[PDB]
Structures are given as structure tokens and as C-alpha cells.
RNA sequence: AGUCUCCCACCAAUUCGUAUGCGGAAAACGUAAUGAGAUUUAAAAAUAAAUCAACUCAUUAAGGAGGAUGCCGGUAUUCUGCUUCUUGACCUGGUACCUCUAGGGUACUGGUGUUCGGUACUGGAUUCCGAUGGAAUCUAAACCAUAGUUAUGACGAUUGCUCUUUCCUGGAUCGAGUAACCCAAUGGAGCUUACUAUUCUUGGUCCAUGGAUU
């Protein structure tokens, strides 16, 4: 932090230089400095669910989505730092690692409906195709 | 201004106010509004429940879902 | 109607009497002033915020005005009140507005210091700010401090009588009020006269020709000493007569009957009303459906 | 171990039924009136009394349903007066009088036997009315007015409007005290001994009460 | 105008991979339906607190098919199925594997044990090398608005509009007003506040009050 270094540093310029102003085109503002807010309905269907407690077996009409939504409610609400819910939920004072691992993504997605025809991934791990309609 | 505890005169006598109103015209429905102003006037003045497991706890008070301080003789407003 | 705010009463402090020609002249120009058409008239004083005033609560206005002027008041059937203006140059010196503005009627403060104009401005229970205007003023007027404060209950006052005296104070006559109709946006102001003889004196028709000279138009120099000065009487009123503006202990219906334009009817000392009991409960409730007044 | 913290369920519920119960009667009351009035153009019945026979021996389903102000008289307006009577201390000689403390009272007490009157407004169609409170509300003083034939059920706003009462004093030549109220700075009063954030406003809507 | 939010570099995934009533890239953003509360409360001061309105809060995935309530195969309403898909919490213990140099990386499987990531470019001029590439030297810039830097001035001549003196979005006359709140400083989308007292103007609602209808 000695100064010594910024004179020699200037000593491949000029005694004194004088810089400009930033030209109009390249200016912003300054935003705010605390982290950002998430919506409430965002917030309330999280907390309900992670409060909640734990005829071929899969029986699943229509409750697909429930877990297939409360799987990505769960690892937002395990994830995010903007999630500032309450203090009793948390990663392990409610169980998490059990839930939506060895409870619903195998257990309850997998043995209801197989998986449908036309598994040809792609050729690409980024989703890129075409879409032509041949007269029509 | 009022004095250290010369207001209790004037406390006692805006209480015995809104008491007396509930025991005179009370054949009307409508005695609820000067029930909810006495409610409102004892928990402002943060006294202790008047003289409670005697009166106004379910008993000598509040016949129904309104107050028309039932009478003596089982008389009711009958809704 | 038409009000004057200020007819200075001749004293220094609480120190010296007044002498009986002064009081003559008083009169002379208070009746000159009723010839030109003027209502209610005020009464100023003037004191400094850093001297003792009299323990004695009762000696706290030397004015009088009920037992001094009463002849004039019965011929003129003019209305006096009594107004106090406060130097202010330092804060902390004590002597609270406490007691003082209970025996008068108006009370007012002039600040000539930078710390007198933030404590004049925020945090009193003033109903007109003055000036100097026959000097230098204290401070570069901001634009917030002084419109921030309008919308209170306080209001700004000029004096002409200093633009028919001398010969240097008309400049800075001329300087300050551009000053302060520039700064406070020219929203609530008000017009008095210190006039020392009636010599001085002018009419509504020679009142706005040296104002509207000065910037300001001509309908708001009018308003000047209409209903805004009205306004400032109805504050000055409202506070030894009700709590919180809203228990007045005034009187009944009827032209010229309220709290400001009644004022012999209201016993001051004891601040009663005793009237003839002439409205009972067994009367029809409408105008003319009752018929006897 | 007695304070059944959890008796309050009753509370709201109370206040629940006042406020539907209110509306109904005030319904009620002005559609009687307005019914029972309309009967007296096509008869010749014109006064208080005749009126009450005809209509409790043609209708008389409905008569139990009217007003009749005299009920809120005897001792509701007339026996109340003596409650501000003894909460100042007013006797024949009042010499001891302490005037700006009866001020601070009387901005705290209770306005319901009481009796009103309008002197100045901001709406002059409404000069002069009197009647006696029954239910005071935040933006409205409900009151009960004698008219010439039949009673009516009056609700006027505080907004802009000027009250007088008068308090009788004693037994000397009939002589009394009077007290008016305003009625834009009347919400922001202290119900009872609280202070409440007194702020301070201006005046400039305050204009008609010296406007003559 | 402001003590206020968001955007003005990218992400196939240590970056809000967030299908959540609807709109929006996002927002201290807008709006629909049902329902409930106000220091006695999820909460405000000790917005509301007779009714309607206002404040705040809770619930509600799109498409398409089937049956019925109502009116002439239809639409508004009501209950039951189906389709939409990139192996995705963090930390950590095991086995198998790897073109990686005793350690790293990848597959299958167990354990409850408030801001932090990677990749990237200065403007201009001159010079050098058997090249859609590489190398060296000098000099300061990037300065850009149909208002653009604290500028928006001093006056005249017609026509509108509001009121009004006499008349015959009707026409001609007599006479007054055209205000209040206020002002750019890098730009935009929002929100929050200030105003129009016979003193510029336009439209509604009232289970507010007074009169006439009836």
C-alpha cells in the first residue's frame, strides 16, 4: 500500500495525467446492496411443503405434478440464500436428504408410468434441432 | 391539568356511565354497540376483569350472540 | 374583512412605563386607522427571548385593552387584540414558551441567528415568523426550510413601515422581500404596518401599489390582509379556548358570533359562557317548523 | 388459572352481529317512516296522536316499529344530563369554577345522552337541525329528531359541521352554560386519558367557521 | 418532483434449470374470483371500526375429452379420466471403471451430517517476420441526444375555451379570466407523494342532507 509503487507505475506516463469523464453512452446507476426478495406465493407453497409430514402402487392420477413440483419446491427452498422462510425449516431439522431421494423420485415417479417410445436423446447436450413442416 | 390521583374520581364515574347504559332500555337488540364501548373502556384503563367469576363471565350477561343482558324472570330476546 | 397585525405599543421591555402622550397618539392613530376601514386591529410587543420575565403570571401583558380603550370600542365597535414578538438569538437560555403564551393572544418570534432560524422553523408552537427588514438577514433563505414549515400552522409577515422611514433601509426593504417572496415561494404571507404616528398609515388601495412593485400580483396582495390574516387570529384563538381544537368554549349562531368575533361576550378570566337557557328538548327539531327564534 | 384468556372468541362475535344488527334496524326504522308517511296524503290525519291510533288499528303489524323520540327522553336525555352535571363539580355558585380543565374533560367523556345542535356547516341545508345521540360513530352522529307528525332516525357527518350543547347550571333566573364542538378535528381525540399522538396541522379548511 | 425497487455482459448448470390463478425479461410491478381479519390481532396507531367502498391476508397449473344444470349440435355453469419430461440439493462413506500423473476424474449404492463460481475484450497511429498467423514501437482516448448542462429570452397579431351584460360544441353582441403544483443533468420500466378555495377545465357515485314528484 506505499505509494512508491504508483510512481513507478506512472513513470511509463506523465508526471500528471488527466483522465476524462466517462462518455454518456457508457455510464449506470448503482442498484441496491441488499440481497433480492422472492415472491410470496413462492414462499408459502415452500413452506407448506416442506412442513408436511412423512392400485398397481403407483395410483398416481394428476398427483405427478404434486411431486414432480414439490421436488423443485424442496431443492429451491434447500438451496437458494433469498429463501429466508422461518426458523425451525431447514436442510436437516426437516428431513430433505430422505424426502425426494428415497422417498418420491425413485419410489414414486419411476414405478407409475414407464417411460414413453422415441428415448433417441439427441446429438447434442444442448437442446438444438429442427423444425420444418414438409407441406405443411 | 390532572393531578397524581385525582383522576380515579373521574375514571370511576365515566365506568359507572357506561355501566348504567346497558340496564336501562335494554328491550332493544342494539345494546351490543354499548356493550363493546364498556369492553373497550376496561381494557383501556388495564384494570383487572371487573370483579369477574360473579358476573359477565357467561352468566347475568350476554343471553346469546348479542348482549341484550338477559332479565330475571328468563326474560329472553328469543332470536 | 380587513385586519391590520401590527400597531407597535410603546414600551422598550418590562422595564420603563409608558408616558400618557404616547398612549394619546395610540389613540389618535387607532381612530385614523378605523376612518380608513379597518375592523380588527392587532397590538404588537416587542421583547427579547434573553431577559427575565415577571414571576407574577398576572403582569404578563401591560396592554390592558378591555379597561384601556373601551370609549373607542363603544363608539368605533372595533375589536383589539394582543400580540408578543420574541428576539431570538441564542437557544438554550431558557424561558419556555410555556406560560407566555397562555396570557396572550398571539405569539410570534424573529430570529437573527443561524440557530434561531433552524429552532424557529421545526420545533415551536409559533403562529407568525418575522424578520428584520431594516437590516441584513441572518442566513441565505433555503428553499426547504422554509416551505416545510408553511405547511404547519405558521406564517410569514411583512412590514411596510420601514419603506416610508429612511433613506438606506429601502434598499434593504427592497432586497429582503424579493428575498422572501423568492424562497418561500409566495404561498403564506401576510402585510402589517409599524406605524409610529398616523402620518404612516395607508389604505387597502395604498397597501398593494408598493407591493405589487416588489414581485407579487395583485389578487394575493389582496388575500394578504383579507382571510389569511383572519386565519392567523383563528390559531391565535384556538389555544386558550379549547384543548386540541376541538372543545371550543364559544357561542351559538348568529352573524358575528365565534370564537374571534366575539370579545366582550366571553369572560376571559374565568374562560366561561353563561347565556339564557332558550333551546330545551321539547322543542320541534327543524328551522322553520319551529317557528318562535 | 382463571383467566380464560380465550373467552374473547365471544368478543368478536358480538361485534359481529352489532354491526349487522345496526344496519337493519336503521332499514327498518326509514322504511317505516317512509311507508307510514305516504298513508297521511291520501287521509286527513295531521298530528302526532291521531296518527298513532290509525296506523296501530289499520296496520298494526308494523306499528310496534317506529321511533316514538319521547321513549328516548324521560330519563336517557333528561336523567343524563346529571352525569356531566356531577363530573365537573357545577353547583349554583361557580366561583370555583376552573375553566381549560372542564376543557380537558369534556374532551374525553361520552356523547351519548346527549342533545345537538347544528349551527354552522359547510352544507346549508342542514342549518339548525336538533335531536339526541344514540350511537356516535367515527364519520357519522346518529340521532333521533322530532318532526311535526312522526319521528325520524338522522345520520349527519362530522366533516365540516359545527355543534353547540348547553348544560343548565342551577335555579337562578334559568341561566346555563354553552359548549360547541367542531367537526374536523374530532377524530383525533383521546377517548380516555391516553394521549395520542397530537400532531399539528394547518387551518385553511377551517375557513366558514369566520367566514361572516 | 423522491432517504424507493428493477434492467442496461454470457451461462445445458457451485449462475435464483422458478412449469406454481393471469400479464411481465425482471420489479418495495399490474390485475380476476372466492373468503376472512384489525393493538381481544398474521400485523399498523393508545387504512377501517352502522351498510357499500378503502387497508391487509389466505386459497386457486394450461390444454383437451366425457356426463349433467339453463336456453335454442351449440354456449355459461358443474364432477371424472388423459397428454405434456434435459437421469439436477450441499457435505460425505463404499465398489466397479478411466485414453488422466502411490494421487485425480466417471458410473451403481448407502448416512441426517444477508452479497463469495468460470470464461472475455481499451481507442488511434507507425513498424517487423518463409500470413484466415505471429511480433515490436509511439500516442492519448473511448465526447455521444429531433431540450441537452444548471441556457429554454424580450414582445406583437388572430382563433379556441369558461363565465357574463343584451339579444335572434345553435348565431350575433357588452365585459372579465386562460390558473394551481412546479422544472430537466446518462437513459428506460415501475411505484410513492404535491395541485386545479362564484381564481383555467371534464366525468361519475352516494342504504349523505333539504325541497318537489307521487
Redesign the interface.
Same mark, same amino acid.
Given at each position: 500500500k506505499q505509494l512508491q509503487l504508483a510512481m513507478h507505475n506512472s513513470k511509463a506516463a506523465s508526471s500528471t495525467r488527466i483522465f476524462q469523464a466517462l462518455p454518456r453512452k457508457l455510464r449506470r446507476r448503482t442498484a441496491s446492496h441488499n440481497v433480492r426478495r422472492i415472491p410470496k406465493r413462492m414462499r408459502n407453497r415452500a413452506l407448506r411443503e416442506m412442513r408436511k409430514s412423512d392400485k398397481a402402487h403407483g395410483l398416481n392420477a394428476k398427483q405427478l405434478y404434486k411431486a414432480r413440483m414439490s421436488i423443485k419446491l424442496l431443492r429451491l427452498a434447500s438451496k437458494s440464500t433469498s429463501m429466508k422462510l422461518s426458523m425451525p425449516p431447514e436442510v436437516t431439522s426437516s428431513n430433505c436428504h430422505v424426502r425426494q431421494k428415497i422417498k418420491t423420485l425413485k419410489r414414486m415417479i419411476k414405478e407409475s408410468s414407464t417411460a414413453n417410445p422415441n428415448i433417441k436423446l439427441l446429438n447434442n447436450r444442448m437442446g438444438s434441432y429442427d423444425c420444418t413442416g414438409v407441406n405443411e | 391539568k390532572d393531578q397524581a390521583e385525582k383522576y380515579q374520581e373521574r375514571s370511576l364515574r365515566q365506568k359507572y356511565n357506561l355501566l348504567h347504559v346497558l340496564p336501562t332500555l335494554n328491550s332493544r337488540a342494539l345494546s351490543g354497540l354499548y356493550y363493546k364501548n364498556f369492553h373497550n373502556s376496561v381494557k383501556r384503563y388495564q384494570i383487572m376483569l371487573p370483579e369477574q367469576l360473579k358476573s359477565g363471565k357467561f352468566c347475568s350477561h350476554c343471553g346469546c350472540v348479542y348482549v341484550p343482558n338477559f332479565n330475571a324472570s328468563l326474560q329472553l330476546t328469543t332470536n | 374583512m380587513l385586519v391590520d397585525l401590527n400597531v407597535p405599543w410603546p414600551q422598550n421591555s418590562y422595564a420603563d412605563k409608558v408616558t400618557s402622550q404616547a398612549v394619546n397618539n395610540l389613540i389618535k392613530t387607532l381612530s385614523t386607522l378605523h376612518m380608513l376601514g379597518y375592523t380588527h386591529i392587532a397590538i404588537n410587543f416587542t421583547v427579547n427571548h434573553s431577559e427575565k420575565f415577571p414571576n407574577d403570571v398576572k403582569l404578563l401583558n401591560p396592554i390592558d385593552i378591555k379597561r384601556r380603550f373601551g370609549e373607542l370600542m363603544d363608539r368605533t365597535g372595533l375589536k383589539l387584540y394582543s400580540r408578543i414578538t420574541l428576539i431570538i438569538d441564542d437557544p438554550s437560555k431558557g424561558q419556555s414558551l410555556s406560560k407566555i403564551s397562555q396570557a396572550f393572544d398571539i405569539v410570534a418570534a424573529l430570529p437573527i441567528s443561524e440557530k434561531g432560524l433552524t429552532l424557529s422553523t421545526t420545533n415551536l408552537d409559533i403562529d407568525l415568523l418575522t424578520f428584520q427588514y431594516g437590516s441584513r438577514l441572518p442566513t441565505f433563505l433555503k428553499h426547504k426550510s422554509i416551505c416545510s414549515c408553511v405547511?404547519?400552522?405558521v406564517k410569514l409577515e411583512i412590514v411596510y413601515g420601514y419603506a416610508l422611514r429612511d433613506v438606506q433601509a429601502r434598499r434593504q426593504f427592497v432586497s429582503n422581500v424579493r428575498s422572501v417572496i423568492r424562497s418561500s415561494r409566495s404561498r403564506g404571507i401576510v402585510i402589517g404596518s409599524g406605524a409610529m404616528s398616523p402620518l404612516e398609515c395607508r389604505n387597502i388601495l395604498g397597501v398593494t401599489s408598493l407591493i405589487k412593485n416588489l414581485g407579487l400580483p395583485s389578487d394575493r396582495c389582496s388575500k394578504a390582509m383579507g382571510?389569511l390574516a =383572519?386565519?392567523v387570529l383563528?390559531?391565535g384563538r384556538?389555544r386558550?379556548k =379549547?384543548?386540541?381544537?376541538? +372543545?371550543?368554549?364559544?357561542?351559538?349562531?348568529g352573524?358575528?358570533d365565534?370564537v374571534?368575533?366575539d370579545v366582550q361576550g366571553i369572560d376571559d378570566v374565568?374562560?366561561?359562557?353563561?347565556? %339564557?337557557?332558550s333551546?330545551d328538548? !321539547?322543542?320541534?327539531?327543524?328551522?322553520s %317548523?319551529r317557528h318562535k327564534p | 388459572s382463571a383467566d380464560k384468556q380465550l373467552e374473547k372468541r365471544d368478543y368478536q362475535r358480538i361485534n359481529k352481529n352489532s354491526k349487522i344488527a345496526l344496519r337493519e334496524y336503521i332499514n327498518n326504522c326509514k322504511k317505516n317512516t317512509k311507508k307510514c308517511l305516504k298513508l297521511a296524503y291520501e287521509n286527513k290525519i295531521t298530528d302526532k296522536e291521531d296518527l298513532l291510533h290509525y296506523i296501530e288499528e289499520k296496520h298494526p303489524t308494523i306499528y310496534e316499529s317506529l321511533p316514538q323520540y319521547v321513549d328516548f327522553?324521560p330519563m336517557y336525555? !333528561?336523567l343524563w344530563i346529571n352525569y356531566i352535571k356531577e363530573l365537573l363539580n357545577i353547583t349554583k355558585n361557580?366561583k370555583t369554577?376552573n375553566? =381549560?380543565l372542564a376543557?380537558?374533560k369534556?374532551?374525553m367523556a361520552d356523547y351519548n345522552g346527549a342533545?345537538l345542535?347544528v349551527? %354552522?356547516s359547510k352544507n346549508k341545508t342542514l342549518?339548525?337541525?336538533?335531536? +339526541?345521540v344514540i350511537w356516535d360513530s367515527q364519520k357519522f352522529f346518529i340521532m333521533i329528531? %322530532?318532526?311535526?307528525i312522526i319521528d325520524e332516525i338522522k345520520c349527519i357527518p362530522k366533516k365540516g359541521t359545527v355543534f353547540?350543547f !348547553?348544560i343548565?347550571?342551577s335555579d337562578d333566573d334559568? =341561566?346555563?352554560? &354553552?359548549?360547541? +364542538?367542531?367537526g374536523d378535528?374530532?377524530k383525533?381525540?383521546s377517548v380516555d386519558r391516553a394521549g395520542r399522538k397530537?400532531k399539528?396541522? &394547518?387551518?385553511?379548511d377551517?375557513?366558514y367557521? +369566520?367566514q361572516?
Open positions: - | - | 405547511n404547519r400552522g382571510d =383572519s386565519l383563528l390559531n384556538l386558550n =379549547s384543548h386540541k381544537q376541538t +372543545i371550543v368554549t364559544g357561542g351559538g349562531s352573524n358575528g365565534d374571534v368575533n374565568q374562560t366561561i359562557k353563561v347565556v %339564557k337557557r333551546m328538548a !321539547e322543542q320541534l327539531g327543524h328551522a %317548523k | 327522553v336525555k !333528561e361557580l369554577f375553566g =381549560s376543557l380537558l369534556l374532551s342533545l345542535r349551527t %354552522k342549518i339548525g337541525l336538533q335531536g +339526541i329528531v %322530532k318532526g311535526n353547540q !348547553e343548565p347550571i334559568d =341561566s346555563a352554560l &354553552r359548549y360547541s +364542538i367542531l378535528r374530532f383525533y381525540r397530537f399539528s396541522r &394547518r387551518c385553511d377551517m375557513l367557521y +369566520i361572516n
